């Protein structure tokens, strides 16, 4: 009887994070040109840890 | 009925900072085979900046 808001039925079973891994592993993947090395290595880094 | 110094119209509209800009992402993108790291270091961290 009751309406109800629903997540996806992806987002329940976990693999949109697969998603945001493959995403973020390209990213490490990538050179960042404009910007130092220092600067990526913070960022990489970070990511790593996630 | 007054002189009147203007300025160009593409200045008031800012958009000279995107010639700026793209001029300063040139010059951090180039090596600099002369001088050392530590010079082009700090060079591209001050563009970054802005």
New interface residues.
């Given amino acids: 009887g009751v309406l109800n808001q629903v997540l996806n039925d992806n987002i329940r079973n976990g693999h949109v994070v697969n998603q945001l891994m493959e995403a973020l592993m390209q990213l490490s993947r990538q050179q960042f040109?404009?910007?130092?090395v220092d600067?990526k290595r913070s960022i990489q880094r970070g990511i790593l840890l996630l």
Same sequence: chains 1, 2.
């Fill in positions: 040109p404009t910007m130092p600067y």
